[PDB]
Ligand binder design. Structure first.
Ligand SMILES: NC(=O)c1ccc[n+]([C@@H]2O[C@H](COP(=O)([O-])OP(=O)(O)OC[C@H]3O[C@@H](n4cnc5c(N)ncnc54)[C@H](OP(=O)(O)O)[C@@H]3O)[C@@H](O)[C@H]2O)c1
Ligand SMILES: NC(=O)c1ccc[n+]([C@@H]2O[C@H](COP(=O)([O-])OP(=O)(O)OC[C@H]3O[C@@H](n4cnc5c(N)ncnc54)[C@H](OP(=O)(O)O)[C@@H]3O)[C@@H](O)[C@H]2O)c1
Ligand SMILES: NC(=O)c1ccc[n+]([C@@H]2O[C@H](COP(=O)([O-])OP(=O)(O)OC[C@H]3O[C@@H](n4cnc5c(N)ncnc54)[C@H](OP(=O)(O)O)[C@@H]3O)[C@@H](O)[C@H]2O)c1
Ligand SMILES: NC(=O)c1ccc[n+]([C@@H]2O[C@H](COP(=O)([O-])OP(=O)(O)OC[C@H]3O[C@@H](n4cnc5c(N)ncnc54)[C@H](OP(=O)(O)O)[C@@H]3O)[C@@H](O)[C@H]2O)c1
Ligand SMILES: N=C(CCC(=O)O)C(=O)O
Ligand SMILES: N=C(CCC(=O)O)C(=O)O
Ligand SMILES: N=C(CCC(=O)O)C(=O)O
Ligand SMILES: N=C(CCC(=O)O)C(=O)O
Lengths: 449, 449, 449, 449
């Protein structure tokens, strides 16, 4: 039995929500599910051998965790980052079970990736790695078996290289991956889906907490990250009349120097930088206009703030940063990143919600579900031999995020207690709602009794 | 060439309708189809070895008759009953060809099952048997090959155990079976579909026979059986304002002691008894309130009656019972059960229709088609990556049953003669309509020339 | 549960040997095997549609009984005869389990065929039927799964058409069938193997019964049948210095009119007749030279006789014929045909052995095993990428038949009682030896416990 | 990157032999192999769900490490022990690469198993677990892909249950596993092979070290373990005229109380105890006759000794025990167990060899190779459709062990230095010989360049 801190972190939060609720008082038989659900159905690791631009034989480790398939084929992204290991991918894959359950679409949970580092690699090297990766993975996936997509380090470029290699090796053209190109079975809204869905979720939070007194307009938002989720979270914020006060990467943070915050052209500039695996610091002009802080996160540096959207990586909000956010005025936190808040930050936010200023955390498995939701929609369009409009997909996305919110608050009211401020735990509601659905389907298919 | 009485019975009725009609005068080439269509495309038998709760090695025989696939993949239920043998399953599978053709959905015909007896078995034993059965069957079925579901003795519990075992063994999540759980690709209305569709069919019969003078409201209905088909036939009858005067099982019959008949809470009580494989006699309270007759069928015991719905098993209405029904006032018979009426009962009812009181039999292959129709709809929802509403499925079901009625009366008028009472044979119309469609598709795919 | 007389006959003889022996006194747990072993692992039936020389759409039923695979892949011949049905093929497939066990080669037991009648068909029609048959069967067989060969009505012509169709459909060249052509993975001695092995077995019988006082030289032999087994039994008899007094077909019997009996040129003439599906009666010259009896079997017509070799079909020796054989001097009977002796004939011969003149029956599952033995050798040569010499295969065949004899007498002495004449039952010894081996392997692989 | 101590231990010893030798001076390009070879080609983990005798849903983790396939299909045993995890199975699978290379047979290296604990389980539970395990593994193995067999906790009973389940699920009868039953493609000598091969290896050690002055006769041997390897090592020792002074299990050690040591009937008694998963302590009579020490290993308790055969598990000889062995007279150590000697014990023995009393360690990857060698021979017999005699297999085994010895000493002389006592390192020679072969084949197939 090995040391898997991130997996254990994610497991402890979920199980804590469940065990602290009335669920096992009402349904004591469900206790039997926990030892079973927490062992993946299957894990694959494989050597990935590839050739660099200098002709050297290179090697990296690849993985696919197929955690749960009670509700559908395994579904979840691929992460290319030098930190990747089994522990991280188990955290993500376990989260993904419950997140996918919340969407209402027929998707099991999985996650995979490699310790391959895209930084410093050419597009040629990345194509070659992608192809080599898929030459290991193809036999273990399929449109009704396991449907990947892109997570950290895995762009449309990578996903599409993988689609191409699968279609060649299996000699079929199907919905094996999502995040595809629009000419090859892609969905409108898929690039935008995660970040748009985070912001949709926040609109439901503001409505509920203010009992309809306020909207997202004029809210000051601190975003971290500068990739797929952060970009479109920032762009949706701006569309909705909110103020984007920060954006960040692994090297530092850009703090807007105007009360109007960052504007769309600036997000597009950063998008172009990240397409070339460059850093925010590499725009001399953005840095001179705004306030660039090498080595820092946004949270303690953004001044007065209303919303925080962690959109980079796990454990990117410390307990100290959570408390600083609240002192700076923050009352809504929604995780674009998977497990963005550290365990200590979760506790700070949950105590605020219960007893303090009422700062309200939406967990990633609810708030960030828009991406995998629109992936499900991509699967549906592929099966239907159809391509829906932007408006059609966005409306479905909005309806899904609303349903996740409603499931979360309904389940929290049924099994939990909100505390002094009467603000239900989105953390507890998402965990319990997702677990109950999966456990029920598991029982039907024979996974436990 | 072996003795297969039930198969021969079912074959003789179908062929009699066809040969007594003008069909082969108009299309003499169709005579060539009969020797071909009546040999199944394929039959599988397999040993099913399993372990009882005492640890003993047990064995039963399993089967899948894949009768015809001109119109689609094989489709039809699985029956667990100690009577099961090849003859019975051929009867059912041959019927199923024509029934499935009538639905208008792309479904071939098949049937399977085992002589395994669920009575006296634990849920644990039933899970184990289900899994063992599917470990024999899986290689011969698939979402575009052969899609089973539940018949006598095969509940959602069994179907879902089988789905789980298939998905594990084939490592894919697809519409391999219908009658699935709502969290795992099930359809709304599927449990209700057969019994609801029987009653829908009867409404068309009353409208036609009374030329719009009467409705189902207030009609006194004798139901046999107490399982999936009988339960929802009884509940639909009550919803429609009819009076349910009986319900039965293999041990006896409950006759209502009030003119109001049985009420929904009583049907639900019986439903709960049957979930535990108990008998009607095991409710002391139901028996004390009503009139329980050990060892009897409803037909001669229900007093005055308007409709008879055989919803248990084949050959459950004798010729003597048919005549007694008519003396008791019965003018509509609709088979929920497959081949519920004995050959002698069919003749009594067809002569009544032609020349007597006008008592009108709807054959199972028309009246009971709602179940496999909604199975087809479940296949469509699975393929579409969609879950339709209850209202949406029920409306489709109603439209299918109406279309089966119209096909039946249209074809009877075209090729047959109704006799003195001008009431077209639903028996003959269903048989000829179904046969013509299948024969036409067979010719296209090369099965005959 | 259907009427399967031939299966029941074969089962009753085997089980009688076992239950009348000490086996279940020594190993009482083996009683549990009988209900399991007697249900085939799998049965396939399929429609076989084909086109005659006049262009008509024709249909026949095909079958493959896969009875037992504890010792190896299913193995056994295909029979084309209008009598064929499931009962007959179950008899043969059940026999084949035990026969294959006796050979010592890794072969399970199965049998298949069709009610297709080769008589009156052209070679063109037979090619077409063969191909159609294999287009149904191919997915259920394979070199390590189920390896057919030719039984009644299935010649090398048929087997090779089937090989060709399999290799095309599966795009591989392997030992899927035995009885192949020498240019396509055939074995030397395979055509001769059954009839040669029968005569080898008889040599062991004469040695044992006469305690080395006599040989096969000069023995007068009555053979029935005129196909693959009879031909080479007759030719081996002649090589060994015995006298062939008869040969027969479905239309009548040729009795030799000389004490020298039939000569090889006459057997070759009949071979050529049977290649064209003609009858013995169609040689005017053979009939004029010898004594042809329309409608008769040899047994009561051959005059004085020492050995009887039933080599046509099941139940071709009545109890009355058995008694007549003994009155005519017969002291050895060896079944070339499967279950050649009727149940009443078996009893006559077993009582003779025990208490009378000492007439000694060798059951087909021992005496006729040479064919499937050399099939196993063909499988070994295919796997090895090798073709052994005639001498090499014949020596292996001889060694196998000797080992079957030794196993039979050793097991009979261990578990049975020979009676007054001290001649062990070859019937009982073969049945018990074969059953013990299969039961032991079944237990190891989990088929029973 | 996780903590994998056993894997790291095994890797460090191998790489130390290689890096301390002249190999990379002669062939510097081989340095590139180490980062590649040490990442498995593939790892599978899977949940194994099963039912205990009380009907409870149980779960365990299963694994198959497919480490290297340059020389053949993956090959190596399955271990059922509550300690099992990925680290242990990687140690074993990495060892297995090199061991399999040394045999000269075309076998890659792998290992798998489960944390399932057979102790306290019924044979029924073990059958059920075995079957469930194989229902997870079957798709990832095959006769030309990955061929398992039995390691700690995996008996013929388990292996054969697994064969049965594979043959059912894949519908083929092939050499998917080795260690099979003799009626189902087993090899003679396979049960005996590991322990016999250890003792064969020791005979070569004595010949070499004493320059032909001494033999194994009369040598006093301390054996640990009491399972498959220990039993047949003890029985071979006795056949060869050596004295068995100990045998042990996880609960304690039996020290012989006579100078004649243990006799074959005593080993057979222990064999029967271990078939029932009982302990040595459970024989009151053995314990009363001899000297039983609860909680102890043999090494410091056996008195004067010449040979030590660790035959239980990894790290079962401490550095202190190694030094005590030498003080007690031990001059030969041969590992029946994989990595039986701790790292500290290896160093004690290698310094003795180099500079001290000349105590000589043979590593498991050489000494214990007889088991997988005879597995390879079982694969060859299966492919050939043949069963070789005991004598034939034992002669091949003896020839393999001699060849492993010769390869080891030849390679040690070529690339290493023996030290003062002129006794070549069997440790270094096995590691380098095995690595060079695998690296060469890897290069040919494109695994590195
Ligand atoms: N994409 C989806 O559909 C989706 C859906 C749900 C949730 N998520 C989650 O959203 C987060 C971001 O994913 P993405 O798709 O936007 O990936 P992305 O496009 O690769 O962007 C990741 C961003 O996070 C930063 N980052 C990554 N790892 C970091 C680390 N260890 N320390 C600090 N900064 C780090 C990167 O910095 P650099 O630019 O300096 O490299 C970059 O700005 C992840 O937690 C992911 O699991 C993604
Ligand atoms: N389910 C479908 O979708 C479907 C569709 C079309 C037609 N059908 C037909 O409808 C009938 C009932 O099926 P079901 O799904 O309702 O099965 P079910 O749930 O198993 O119920 C069967 C009922 O019939 C009784 N029964 C069964 N075999 C009997 C026999 N030999 N003698 C007397 N009573 C017997 C049972 O009595 P106990 O409760 O005492 O056991 C029970 O009340 C069958 O003819 C079936 O083929 C079913
Ligand atoms: N071939 C093998 O390797 C093999 C091995 C072991 C045992 N057997 C058994 O040996 C017997 C003969 O097989 P075979 O391969 O020699 O077949 P074959 O070449 O087709 O010859 C069959 C012979 O038996 C006659 N016959 C068949 N069915 C008959 C019936 N119902 N009534 C009377 N005569 C009948 C045929 O008469 P016509 O010539 O008039 O048609 C013909 O002479 C069978 O019992 C078979 O199962 C065969
Ligand atoms: N079998 C093969 O072909 C083969 C080939 C090469 C090498 N090996 C190696 O040989 C060794 C023994 O394998 P085997 O096949 O003989 O297994 P086995 O039949 O299961 O016997 C294992 C023996 O070792 C003892 N044991 C196991 N784990 C132990 C632990 N953690 N602490 C102390 N004692 C322990 C057991 O004690 P209990 O009886 O108390 O349970 C038993 O006496 C292993 O290292 C294995 O990898 C086996
Ligand atoms: N990266 C994902 C989802 C990938 C997908 O759309 O399957 C996530 O939910 O974190
Ligand atoms: N039990 C069935 C139908 C099963 C199905 O829905 O395929 C029937 O039509 O009798
Ligand atoms: N016809 C056979 C054997 C066919 C074969 O060689 O597999 C028989 O044993 O009856
Ligand atoms: N248990 C094994 C070998 C298993 C096998 O024979 O494949 C070993 O070498 O440790």
């Amino acid at each position: 039995t090995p040391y898997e801190p991130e997996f254990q972190q994610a497991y402890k939060e979920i199980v804590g929500s469940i065990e602290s609720s009335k669920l096992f008082e009402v349904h004591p038989e469900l206790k039997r599910v926990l030892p079973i659900i927490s062992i993946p159905e299957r894990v694959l690791e494989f050597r990935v051998t590839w050739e660099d631009d200098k002709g050297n034989c290179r090697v990296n480790t690849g993985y696919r965790v197929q955690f749960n398939s009670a509700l559908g084929p395994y579904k979840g992204g691929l992460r290319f980052h030098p930190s990747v290991n089994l522990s991280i991918l188990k955290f993500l894959g376990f989260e993904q079970i419950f997140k996918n359950a919340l969407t209402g679409l027929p998707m099991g949970g999985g996650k995979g990736g490699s310790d391959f580092d895209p930084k410093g690699k050419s597009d040629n090297e990345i194509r070659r790695f992608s192809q080599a990766f898929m030459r290991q993975l193809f036999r273990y996936i399929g449109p009704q078996t396991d449907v990947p997509a892109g997570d950290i380090g895995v762009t449309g470029f990578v996903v599409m290289h993988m689609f191409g290699e699968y279609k060649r090796l299996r000699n079929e053209y199907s919905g094996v991956v999502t995040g595809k190109h629009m000419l090859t079975g892609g969905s409108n809204i898929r690039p935008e889906a995660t970040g748009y869905g985070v912001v949709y979720y926040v609109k439901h939070m503001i409505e509920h907490r203010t009992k309809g007194a306020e909207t997202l307009k004029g809210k000051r938002v601190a975003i971290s990250g500068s990739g797929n989720v952060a970009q479109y979270a920032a762009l949706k914020c701006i569309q909705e009349g909110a103020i984007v006060k920060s954006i960040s990467d692994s090297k530092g943070v850009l703090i807007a120097k105007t009360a109007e915050g960052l504007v769309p052209e600036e997000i597009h500039e950063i998008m172009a930088l990240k397409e070339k695996r460059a850093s925010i610091a590499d725009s001399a002009s953005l840095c001179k206009k705004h306030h660039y802080i090498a080595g820092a996160r946004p949270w303690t540096n953004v001044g007065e703030i209303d919303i925080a959207l962690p959109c980079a990586t796990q454990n990117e909000v410390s307990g100290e940063e959570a408390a600083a956010l609240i002192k700076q005025g923050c009352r809504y936190v929604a995780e674009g990143s998977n497990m963005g808040s550290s365990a200590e930050a979760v506790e700070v936010f949950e105590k605020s919600r219960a007893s303090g200023e009422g700062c309200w955390l939406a967990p990633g498995k609810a708030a960030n579900a828009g991406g995998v939701a629109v992936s499900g929609l991509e699967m549906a369009q592929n099966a239907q031999f159809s391509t829906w409009t932007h408006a059609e997909v966005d409306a479905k996305l909005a309806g899904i995020m609303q349903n996740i919110f409603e499931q979360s608050t309904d389940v929290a009211s049924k099994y939990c207690d909100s505390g002094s401020n009467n603000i239900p735990s989105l953390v507890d509601g998402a965990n319990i709602a997702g677990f109950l659905k999966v456990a029920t389907a598991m029982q039907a298919v024979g996974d436990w009794w």
